[PDB]
Ligand binder design. Structure first.
Ligand SMILES: N[C@@H](CC(=O)N1CCn2c(nnc2C(F)(F)F)C1)Cc1cc(F)c(F)cc1F
Ligand SMILES: N[C@@H](CC(=O)N1CCn2c(nnc2C(F)(F)F)C1)Cc1cc(F)c(F)cc1F
Lengths: 715, 715
């Protein structure tokens, strides 16, 4: 019966027990994980779940200068560990860290804990270090150049590129927009030979600069800025501006000759990935055109420079970013996820580019390709075949027989062993916070490592609202999925205020059979009905449902949020005059769109870190859905929150971080002044030195307290 | 009985009729004024108030390319008019304008309207043009250099200085901080000879730069910034940073030789003014030290460069800026306002520097010295001898007899004729919006030009709260003046919420017997008791009362605002739990100080454009009261709103303009983050591209609507 406390939510007091840093060892029988302390790396058996041994310990390693470590990686051989310390984030995926090599060699007592640890580099902190296939070399990036460490040669460090320059030329790591929008941090590969390095070189010299102020602030304090403010500058192309010029280069480890691949790509095209195949003489180069609807897979010869078109996959809309990391190479074959038939499905290709078979078919979506077992010819993947709200692990055999491997319905995230014999399963649903099991490739639970019983017990003493799923029919006959969360004291006799939550961005889903206690859960415990509906444009229901928004985003999503409010307003326990809506990022943009759709259904709303005109956002994301402002002028105008701002109805709170390198604070500053000149009253909360995550010290608690009080006062 | 409408207040619908651009002509019998149209300049008699003639008309002037004009100036002779068009503000006092010379020569019909108008310069817009004593030359500034126009030589334009450079060297106009804090826009003078030009040269090259973003915005839209924002940069030294290096230079009109005056000034001193005397060979140079408590008046020879100390005036606190423009030169004598005896009083000096007499004495303050009539030896000035709430015009004869010239008690602002024979009087009090009379130097009303009867009649239909003055005693026995404004329906039976308004800055006063209808008046008509009290630190009551705050500003002012709230809270018609406070500029800073003084008396407050730590503010103002941060570390800490922020009590709204070149938006951004990390909830309203005035298009209406709703919701 006690009441949830927001501070418990924001401080993560109900964060379920989990396992971090799980890496399948090459042997195929074992996995390693990080200790909770962050001070040990411990080996375990997939088959039994038994602790085999502690392989690494900060208090039991020689010349180890760090107290805790952040992350780690095994050499492909299994004899060395690359360990990262002092991890310093740059953008969402990039960071520097001081890395260390730890050899896994047994001593006189047969233990791997008393070895000596070698600083990976006597120079400065490193980016994206990667082992060569034999484990004898590590390539890394620092100051936008590539460096090579030869472990057989005294950790011999050589400099591969000399033209790296800040805000000008990047070697082996992507620029801001590629990193954010193709979702990756490394373009740096070794050949199966161990003889060649391949990398993408980004020339962003003629990409526009963007700069915003930095104040001293607090948590952290930037002390040089105590009296006079400073600034942050970086390359960021807005919609329709020029992107980096990119090319693929190779470096011959024994020769030291650098070569450029002769890739026939459009001047304004992209190279979202490179990947060495299992063939030593074949480097996969993935390329898109600027409209992002033609994916061309090339095989480049790292020595001759010759590039051969292997596959062309085309769309009347666009190719999604998630395809690229589902391309896995094997001696004679490779996988490909494609939406050609209207659903995300798995295709199996020969290494000549020749379609062997369509592995999955049906009106469901494959989410991830987990791997192929050559022993039986069988494919492992996750999908939502059960329902768009769920994900389960599946196996399809060589003849086409499908078996679902998950024991329980909800959200199943598997991490397979090297051999596909075993997998670790992390599971949740609305009622299960986390349950971690070890399973074999038939689905049998070999061991239950974590059940989160202690969490359930602690929770037992609190009065927890419960989510329930529901569907309803829009006025044009579309089924929408949503969840509804009612106070634990709910009465059909009483009428209640409503808080709608949504994200609503292309391909996204927030209606998922998974567990959480969030700020929404807290709102529900304060007496609100909290509802979340995934409108048109969201993922999991195939291409037509997702991409009906193409060239004019936000409009259809906004009507479906208005339709959701009308439907709630008809319910006898809902006070239609007290309906609020909020969201963050695309969700904040959708709050503005929805509150100014024309039907005055919302009393109040909060838009956090909201884009307000798509011309302020970046090239790769915006153009994927909208093309450029010059090709799609009317679409940009119609998708803009500015155009419909005179119909804004309800009390609005705009929240933004002033150091947002993702949705620039420009969005909020320009939109607010439009609102001022229209005579619309609204409220603001701007956060000094905060980015798109708005976090730091007491910031999140402060922010959710502000949102709580805003809806308490306006609903 | 109708209700005031805020939109009428912000659109200036009750702005009293007045007269603009009143200039006393040299003859001493006449004044000129601008038409309301802005299209005519019309001559009138002081003696009779009769219209003599229209001297200038846009529709009746030849080769006149403008529809309206902004301002105008007469040649010292009376034969030419310098007229300004296209006035473009830069800071509070500086602007560029395209000027035109119009000769006042009669035609065949005897009229001055059909003449030809000459563009003052074929080059670009000009700054601070000034006539030579004979009227044959005009000096002006453009692009930080001095130019000379010789009207007897075909409007011959020559360039006096060649080293002017933006953000580097200014000739003849002050930098940002001198302009704002010594209150002037021109350091450019001709000798009585008409033979020499003198000017101050500002070298701000080593003053720090400050930059803030500019967005496109609206009203005005900055169209180049529609996609990518820009910035504004200028020189602005914060407290304790270096000021411009300054010197006085002269240019020999016939010789073209430039010379530097040998002024013995401290390295870090100021030259707040230069002024040519009635002696052709004597240039007054006014200088302060950096502590601003030693005013040294020098007489410089423009040819020999030799400078002679004429007067030293010293203070244990500081010399106020208002003294400099009260120094008026005569053939054998000059005036000086000084606070040496503890009150602002008028002193009469010989031109050798030798005190002839103390003209005024008593425990009241002289506000302005209006002039000296040599015929009777008599002095004209304004003072508050009646009460700190009032100002009247006074005359003191050669033998010491004093006569008060004003007919009515309240606020009397006089503009004397060249000869001191007549003056124009603008008058108001709590009940008189504006009454404009013409009076002779005994006080007799010769004519009443304006009575604002129409305004009174329009007002008659509205229900107007009325101000009344009051005093009360603080707990340490100090008498404070305040005004109280109650709703027109006031009842002693009812209990009411309170809105306190204050400015509270050193030497300022808001409790004045003068007329206005403001946002406060609107709040009163919505059912609030609105109170304003001038606490310790404010002006008009002598040096001890004003400067008891020296070296630790804000603390004492804040206690007196808390004492005002306690006193109001004891009244039976005041609900002590519903007391709010607000202010703008220093008044916004005082809102924070007062709301975090420690006694939790305020329910809510609004701080507009508030300084929050004095180290963020500029050198001349801050140091006048606080010296530098390095000399007064503990004083800066104790005056800071940051230090006491943990005691903030009540709901706060912070309002700021993001392009504030005066109180940088840094103040608000740094303070808000301090509040976030302390866990204090507050509200914000930031205004894109707005300066310290926060105005533009619908901005003011939007802003006062926001303040109204904030107190309505929190009180
Ligand atoms: N910038 C966008 C990034 C994104 O949408 N994807 C990149 C990463 N990704 C995606 N799909 N899978 C992956 C990942 F697995 F690589 F991470 C799509 C997200 C995003 C959308 C907005 F409208 C906005 F205002 C801010 C914002 F940060
Ligand atoms: N910057 C200050 C200027 C001033 O106080 N004087 C300059 C002009 N002046 C004065 N006294 N007479 C005159 C004038 F007649 F010259 F105008 C004093 C005003 C001021 C005080 C603050 F705390 C602040 F946060 C902003 C701000 F703009």
């Amino acid at each position: 019966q006690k009441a949830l406390d927001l501070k418990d939510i924001t401080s993560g007091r109900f964060r379920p027990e989990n396992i971090q840093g799980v890496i399948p060892m090459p042997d195929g029988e074992h996995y390693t994980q990080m200790s909770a302390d962050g001070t040990q790396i411990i080996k375990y058996s997939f088959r039994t779940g038994e602790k085999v041994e502690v392989i690494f310990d900060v208090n039991q390693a020689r010349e180890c200068d760090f107290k805790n470590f952040d992350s780690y990686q095994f050499s492909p051989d299994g004899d060395k560990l690359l360990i990262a310390t002092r991890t310093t984030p740059i953008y969402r995926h990039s960071y520097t860290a001081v890395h260390y090599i730890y050899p896994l060699k047994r001593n006189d007592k047969g233990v791997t804990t008393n070895n000596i640890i070698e600083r990976l580099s006597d120079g400065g902190p490193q980016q994206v270090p990667v082992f060569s296939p034999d484990g004898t070399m590590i390539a890394f990036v620092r100051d936008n150049n590539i460096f090579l460490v030869k472990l057989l040669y005294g950790n011999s460090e050589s400099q591969v590129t000399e033209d790296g320059k800040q805000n000008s030329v990047l070697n082996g790591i992507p620029d801001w927009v590629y990193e954010e929008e193709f979702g990756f941090n490394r373009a740096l590969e070794f050949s199966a030979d161990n003889t060649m390095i391949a990398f993408i070189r980004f020339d962003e010299s003629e990409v526009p600069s963007y700069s915003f102020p930095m104040f001293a602030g607090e948590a952290p304090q930037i002390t040089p800025l105590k009296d006079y403010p400073g600034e942050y500058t970086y390359k960021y192309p807005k919609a329709g501006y020029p992107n980096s010029k990119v090319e693929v280069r190779t470096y011959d480890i024994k020769s030291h000759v650098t070569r450029t691949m002769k890739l026939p790509i459009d001047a304004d095209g992209y190279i979202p990935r490179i990947r060495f195949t299992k063939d030593a003489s074949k480097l996969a180069v993935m390329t898109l055109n600027r409209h992002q609807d033609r994916f061309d897979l090339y095989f480049a010869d790292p020595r001759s420079t010759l590039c051969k078109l292997v596959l062309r996959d085309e769309s009347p809309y666009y190719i999604k970013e998630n395809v690229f990391d589902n391309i896995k190479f094997y001696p004679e074959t490779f996988s490909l996820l494609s939406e050609r038939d209207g659903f995300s499905h798995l295709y199996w290709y020969s290494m000549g580019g020749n379609l062997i078979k369509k592995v999955t078919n049906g009106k469901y979506e494959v989410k991830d390709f987990l791997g192929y077992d050559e022993a039986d010819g069988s494919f492992y993947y996750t999908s939502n075949e059960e329902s768009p709200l769920r994900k389960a692990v599946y196996k399809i055999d060589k003849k086409g027989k499908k078996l679902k491997l998950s024991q329980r319905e909800g959200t199943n995230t598997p991490l397979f062993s090297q051999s596909m014999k075993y997998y670790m399963n992390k599971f949740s649903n609305l009622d299960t916070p986390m349950l971690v099991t070890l399973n074999d490739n038939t689905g049998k639970t070999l061991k239950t490592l974590i059940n989160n019983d202690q969490l359930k017990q602690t929770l037992s003493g609190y009065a927890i609202p419960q989510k329930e799923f529901f569907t309803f029919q829009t006025t044009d006959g579309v089924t929408l999925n949503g969840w509804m969360m009612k106070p634990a004291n709910f009465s059909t006799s009483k009428k209640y205020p409503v808080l709608m939550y949504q994200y609503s961005g292309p391909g996204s889903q927030q209606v998922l059979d998974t567990w959480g206690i969030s700020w929404e859960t807290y709102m529900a415990s304060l007496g609100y009905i909290v509802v979340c509906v995934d409108g048109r444009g969201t993922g999991g229901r195939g291409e037509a449902f997702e991409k009906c928004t193409y060239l004019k985003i936000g409009v259809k999503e906004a009507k479906d949020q208005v339709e959701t409010a009308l439907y709630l307003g008809k319910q006898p326990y809902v006070d239609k005059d007290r309906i609020g809506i909020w969201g963050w990022s695309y969700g904040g943009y959708m709050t503005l769109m929805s509150m100014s759709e024309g039907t005055p259904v919302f009393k109040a709303g909060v838009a956090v870190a909201a884009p307000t005109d798509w011309r302020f956002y970046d090239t790769i994301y915006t153009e994927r859905f909208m093309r450029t402002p010059k090709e799609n002028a009317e679409g940009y105008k119609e998708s803009s929150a500015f155009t419909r701002a005179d119909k804004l109805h309800g009390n609005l709170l705009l929240v933004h971080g002033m150091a947002d390198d993702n949705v620039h604070f420009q969005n909020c500053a320009e939109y607010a002044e439009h609102l001022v000149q229209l005579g619309k009253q609204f409220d603001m909360q701007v956060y000094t030195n905060r980015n798109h995550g708005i976090y730091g010290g007491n910031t999140r608690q402060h922010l959710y307290t502000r949102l709580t009080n805003f809806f308490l006062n306006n609903l």
